[PDB]
Ligand binder design. Structure first.
Ligand SMILES: Clc1cccc(Cn2ccc3c(N4CCNCC4)nc4ccccc4c32)c1
Ligand SMILES: Clc1cccc(Cn2ccc3c(N4CCNCC4)nc4ccccc4c32)c1
Ligand SMILES: Clc1cccc(Cn2ccc3c(N4CCNCC4)nc4ccccc4c32)c1
Ligand SMILES: *[C@@H]1O[C@H](CO)[C@@H](O)[C@H](O)[C@H]1NC(C)=O
Lengths: 390, 390, 390, 390, 390
């Protein structure tokens, strides 16, 4: 007479108590078989160390009160029942630090043997230990522990819907265009107990994710390489030009502002600075060494009245070794003698300055070649370090 | 006696089960016809790759229990019934990453043959693949897949209220003053199944949106063009003025700070930098080439005591080819001879410096003209690339 | 016996159906009279083009089921009834893009003839077309369309509680200390229909708001005027000082950083830059013209060994028209003659440089006067454009 | 037999209507006595002009239906009753612009004579007029108007739980470590009516809060004082050194970037800039005056070939008043005469330059002393303005 | 016949009033035993002075109505009962300033003797007094006061589930990779009463947390040390080079921008600046002292025409003590005499300038050594202050 679904719902949900764990014998637990597949990784925030993810979640447990024989209800084998009308286990995540905003699924599937199937999408904001030591290339290992918050293992136990290898091999629906690439989701069963009897079942889903370094190549290497190139370009200025020191200090100011700006994107954790901070401070040290060498050569070549003739040891060393590696008439006479003496003093000062300038030029050329070799060695070291990672 | 609407509501909603799928025969699914119209695009966030939109959404399905004959109820053909009092399908979007804040519509229309019509606005925060390769002029292709989360295709199926061409041609209520211009909404039906029997109906609305580049013309082209113009202006400074290198390095510092500031607005995805990053680094390379040319010409013209006379080959080459392309009396004699020799040495140094300065000036003019031609060629290349897009 | 209010509530809310539109005859619509007064304008966001406002909103409709005679209930003419216990129309706003957070008013007034009065505060986040073409002085025109989302005009119709002139003249409770000044709220009734029969009642409240420009005078005009003043101040440096070009380029760098910082506060829409962007680029062009003049005068006055005597045409033109507008003894002779020739060459070079320096000084004074006149003309043009707006 | 509390709850809440105002005679209003004490001031946001506060709030009203005699119920005089089970007045705040997130208190106390006591914490986001004219030392006067949103004064009236002096003297639980110091909370009863009969009771709690200026001393005065100090330090550079104008312009650029950075923390309202903006622009004026006077002295002392001897009036004025305030032999003769004439011209130019340099040095010393006195006067004026405030 | 759990739930929750405090004798209070473990410290915000934490919270109280004998219900000793079906105490925290978003646990355990056990996670946003006086090394002392909001001590009283030493020793589940390290959680019972009879039970959990300074070593010491190092590097430039003052002022500008950028990360409270602000301003003062020394030496060594010979006292003092610490023929004669006099004047000026330059060089070396010693003393003082903390 009446529709089969209406009769079945009247048979099931009438005189049914949704606050009772659905077991005829209270000594057996309800085994909630859960399953998790990752849809997207919305945000990994290394400052507060929380991971935002969206997962598709499904679980099923045996409801010993929602059972019927199909033959009495027009051969119906399954029907959808509202989630509010039946008992639902309190499975949530330990690592929660903020309840997510996820849609509510109002219906669940019930089979004729009691297997209630619940599908639900979840937005998860969970705490995790984010090790940024290898920041551009770091691989993170975040856990998602599903468990019953109140019920012990004697009341609610948790298993897997699918074999752990199948869970590990899932990368199907994952949104992959973002910064973070999902490697694997590894499930593992554990019992959490700090008491002899109070044992709580758990299911740890180790979400392992890898950052894509292509986001940061242009943002990190390009400015540093650009400034190191313009350092070599500015090296060509003659030391006595009077513009070299200004050029170098302006370049150092530019590098300083670049560093203090890019530090906003560079994360910081209990480890401190990441590994690439060492490379950044090495580049800054190279620039400082360039500035110091420029100042030294400026000190050498600067013409000033206290300059004494170049010492014999320095003259020999630089200009050979480093070069190889690379009566009224009597009154008239007195006036001319005095004028000649003045001009001779001026010329002697000029020649001493010229000798010092030559020594400074040779040393500047040698130190420029040494600095260029050091920069090339640093660049090839970085290239080989990147190559063995690729 | 009683009002027609009260009697009709008593007839319908009494002994009516809202947890039962409204089919007299459980073998036929409820076909939920779906219609979606985009009202606005609130935010396209390429960093986290989520799309925020507001859509007007309506659906209708046949409720076989909410049926009556009009003649018994004062010829009423339709009435408004609360949403909470009837069965409502769980149609929601797969691409959800955050449940939106949308008003709740409490009433739905029910016709005398069971057609229940539901109208509701929806704020959607959905994941999408945002390709910013053509960032100023990129056109995005975001999908909105409506499906029943729990029910399979044997329970709930999805069709279109209107023909797909009519859905595609809809641009009526779209808020259009914003940054993003809606091109079309293209619906197309898929079955999603990773099981032999568990098939889920789906309806993908491909929301295709195009960015308006007028937001970024002033923010991008204007600073680069302005700095290129001032570079050409500063080219006019004489190479021996002692201010040209400072001008060039200050301009390079200004361009560096401009780049590191504008990089906050430039998005970054798994692709890396957008295509216009190539143009930006080409402009920076042109500035660096200008700086290198300035430093080289300064090296040539800088007067210093180690300068030797201009070599014959360079003198000929530059100053012809490039120019075409463009007794106490004896004691008195000795002192005068010495003074003349000092002045002769000074004059010879001055004349050698003058010859080198002439060579440097000619080369500076030639290289300035070459750089101007290169800048003009780059500008017209950019203009002709923009023209074929417009 | 019993209290009058208890008996009245028992008479009304018993056997009362809150899901039924309250009309004894279903052919007549329920006319919901709408009134809106604005409390404050919380935020106008020209980037996403959404308007956040707080309004005091009230409506009243005739409830044909909540009617009684006062004489039976101790002469009670009105009572407060919970909003959840009676039918409430679904009046909301089309322009919604985000449901606001507003307090829920649990009670409504019911009169003895069925007039149900509903008072409720509303926080509205609505989309609007924000034209920033006159950004400092722009007047915005944002609509608020109240309508029944589901019900057609045959079911729910909308009127005004007060005449449109009274609504237009309301500026009483409006919080006025903020950036935005409310001019008027203009109501207008319209029918929205894209079908022959499905006509929906609407009531558009055109909220017209005006920005207060005093927020931006100090933030916008003051830096530009200050940098223009220091430009004229630094213009006085002698062209041959060797510091004028550095001063000018430092000033241009300061203006560039000021522009790229203030661009964060300057909004951008589909129009592009606002009108004051033209004024800003004009000021930047004036600074660039000053820099170019400085470079030209430096080119003229710069002392270098390739300088030739000032041509007759330029000498006449500038220095008249522009100024008006503003034997061993024979061996002794040879050495003296050679020394005199050296000194004569040096003096000739010095005098040619002096003549060029004089020409450059006169041209610098003339161009300074021209530039000062141009700056004054620009300032008075801006002042007279502001005056006609005031 | 049964527990006293169970019997009392059965006696009270059975056949009790929570939608009815608890009065046996509908002509008497329910007097809701309000009491408010402030716990903390979470955020004062002068941009959007909203005040965020957390208050402890309690109210009590006479419920004429929740009355019993203690002797019948084991001498119980009060019991806790759920909030949802009884009538609760709709007391909320007019100044609301955003409903706060506050915990829900489920229970209220009911006395044997009907006095129902409701305790609840409230987070309040309310609009206020924030006058920032004295930004570092401003005192704010924000109101909190508690009133019934729907009920008129004939239905719900509002009084004070405690005397207004006791409310004014409350500073007990206030969290005081923050930026804002609470002075007093002043209650005042008003009637709000824009109709002859529709009068609404109100209770205005004038929350008066004072900002602690110690937050801003280091952030505001210290950079300005430091830049003034380095201005005086760099003043000592000789005017002809060639570095003074570069120093001054670099300092002005530093002050400009400091101003445009600190403007992010300086608020802006309809008043415009605060009062300390005048002091900041005075500091900018002093720096610009220093720069202009430096340029003037550079103009005086700059050695150039067009210099004429110092005029008698300027020489006398400065260097007295301001200083007090502070045959082949004939052919031989011709060559010697020509050489002497060249050297004499050079010496005359050198001496004229020396005289101009002396005049410039004396004027520079005088203007340095004048500028130092002006800076000291400004500093003591600021100190004496701060002292009368302290 | 029926399942034991169903019969037990029917026995318990039938005719059970969830709004009644569960005591057969109303004179006894319900002692709620509270236990708390900190899971993580999500955010410590010293600006608004709120502490965001996630805690695991459990409580148990005696329910005198949910009591049964196990032998009547198949030896069941405990069962899970929904939280909504039973009376739950209103325990919340005084220090709340924003209700947290925490998951809702629907079930609680009930034992056969009435012990109802409630487990729940809690996100807490609580006010606290954050003293930043020792900012990089500060240890905070935040309190969490759990109490019943409405109920007095005669109705609800609070104890500890575990002994206070056990609570103090808990650091098990705490997420420890973040910036803040948890030291201890110290519980302490207090009574809060501002009335003779209205005493409220309270329980304060003093959460003591310590910041990890390793976050800020690279962000604070590294830039300051780098700029101090480049200050010493630029100290080597000769004072008469003409680049030393530009170098020093550029370095000071770099330090100024570094300070005004790092001030965004440095917090500010009612105390004002933290203690390390003194160290920062001391470093800036050292830089200013270096700049003043450079300017003084530039004043000494600057060659200008008004230089008089070095005074005897200064010559002796510096160059000894500080060095130790570290007829037509008659017409021919007249012209020669005049030329010799000109050259003699020039040479005398040159020699006076040389003497002043020597004095300036010696003083520059002495002051460089003094400044280096001062910098070393400051560095070792900072190191020895850090060592006694470590
Ligand atoms: Cl990608 C994949 C890989 C293996 C197995 C499955 C099975 N499956 C089918 C559908 C479906 C699922 N739905 C969400 C979207 N609407 C239909 C139901 N949520 C799920 C949540 C967790 C685990 C599996 C599933 C799932 C899928
Ligand atoms: Cl723009 C357009 C173009 C063609 C057809 C229609 C039909 N239509 C009429 C009204 C209406 C609609 N409402 C929202 C505003 N209050 C009245 C009901 N929501 C809708 C949501 C999705 C699809 C269609 C509609 C719709 C519209
Ligand atoms: Cl300013 C003004 C101007 C004209 C008419 C009125 C009448 N009026 C009186 C009170 C009141 C009103 N309430 C909110 C505050 N608690 C009492 C009720 N909300 C309203 C919402 C919309 C329109 C009118 C009103 C209104 C006022
Ligand atoms: C209903 O409509 C029919 C026509 O279909 C008409 O004959 C009949 O009179 C109508 N009844 C009422 C009550 O309007």
């Amino acid at each position: 007479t009446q529709p089969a679904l209406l009769r079945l719902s009247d048979h099931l949900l009438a005189n049914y108590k949704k606050g009772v764990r659905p077991v005829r014998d209270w000594r057996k637990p309800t085994t909630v078989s859960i399953d998790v597949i990752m849809y997207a990784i919305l945000n990994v925030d290394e400052k507060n160390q929380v991971l935002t993810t969206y997962i598709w979640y499904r679980q099923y447990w045996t409801d010993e009160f929602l059972q019927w024989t199909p033959e009495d209800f027009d051969n119906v084998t399954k029907l959808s029942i509202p989630t509010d009308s039946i008992w639902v286990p309190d499975i949530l995540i330990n690592e929660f630090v903020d309840v997510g905003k996820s849609p509510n699924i109002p219906y669940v599937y019930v089979h004729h043997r009691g297997e209630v199937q619940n599908y639900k999408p979840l937005q998860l904001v969970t705490a995790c230990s984010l090790d940024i030591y290898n920041f551009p290339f770091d691989v993170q290992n975040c856990s998602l522990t599903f468990t019953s918050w109140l019920h012990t293992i004697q009341d609610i136990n948790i298993t897997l819907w699918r074999s752990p290898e199948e869970v590990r091999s899932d990368k199907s629906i994952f949104i992959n265009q973002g910064e973070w690439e999902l490697l694997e989701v590894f499930p593992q069963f554990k019992e959490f107990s700090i008491d002899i009897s109070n044992s709580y079942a758990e299911m740890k889903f180790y979400v392992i994710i890898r950052r894509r370094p292509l986001f940061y190549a242009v943002s990190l290497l390009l400015p540093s390489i650009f400034l190191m190139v313009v350092d070599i370009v500015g090296f060509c200025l003659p030391p006595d030009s009077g513009e070299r020191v200004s050029f170098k200090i302006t370049l150092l100011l530019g590098y300083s502002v670049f560093l203090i700006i890019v530090s906003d994107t560079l994360p910081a954790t209990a480890i401190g600075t990441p590994l690439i901070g060492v490379y950044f401070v090495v580049c800054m040290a190279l620039l400082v060494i360039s500035l110091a060498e420029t100042i030294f050569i400026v000190r050498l070549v600067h013409k000033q009245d206290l300059q004494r003739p170049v010492p014999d040891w320095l003259r020999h060393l630089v200009l050979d070794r480093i070069a190889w590696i690379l009566l009224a008439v009597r009154g008239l006479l007195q006036e001319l003698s005095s004028i000649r003496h003045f001009l001779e003093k001026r010329d002697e000062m000029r020649e001493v300055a010229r000798d010092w300038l030559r020594v400074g030029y040779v040393l500047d050329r040698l130190l420029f070649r040494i600095y260029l070799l050091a920069v090339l060695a640093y660049s090839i070291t970085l290239v080989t370090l990147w190559s063995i990672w690729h």
